Amino acid sequence: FLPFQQFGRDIADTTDAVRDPQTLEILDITPCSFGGVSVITPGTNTSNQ
Amino acid sequence: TRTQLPPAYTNSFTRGVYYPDKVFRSSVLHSTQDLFLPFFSNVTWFHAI
Lengths: 49, 49
Ligand SMILES: *[C@@H]1O[C@H](CO)[C@@H](O[C@@H]2O[C@H](CO)[C@@H](O)[C@H](O)[C@H]2NC(C)=O)[C@H](O)[C@H]1NC(C)=O
Ligand SMILES: *[C@@H]1O[C@H](CO)[C@@H](O)[C@H](O)[C@H]1NC(C)=O
Description:
This is part of a larger assembly, with two copies of chain A (49 residues).
Chain A: E1 7-9, E2 15-19, E3 26-28
The structure holds a molecule of 2 linked components (NAG-NAG) and 2-acetamido-2-deoxy-beta-D-glucopyranose (NAG).
């Protein structure tokens, strides 16, 4: 960061950095891994596993 | 003891570019609209000699 600005932005239009208002440090925000859930089955009739 | 002379003029070459905000970006394009200095304009000239 240059010494006159307090944020960092992306194409996504959300903040991704921030200068901590105490330590003058630069912190990167990484979102948590939402992912997706799928399930495999061989059918009800044959088994339940 | 001031000699008066006709005003003089010259041309601008891509001047008047300033960071319109206080936010960081990088390696990316961006369109902005603000009060700027249009390119290749005709500016007024002053000496002191
Ligand atoms: C820059 O601006 C000045 C001021 O308008 C221009 O000077 C005028 O130019 C026209 C066209 O030749 C003349 O009819 C006027 O009499 C001029 N006015 C004065 C006060 O000199 C000038 O032409 C513009 N462009 C440049 C390159 O200087
Ligand atoms: C606030 O006070 C702390 C100590 O209490 C100091 O280290 C810090 O520089 C002060 N300013 C900011 C912006 O935190």
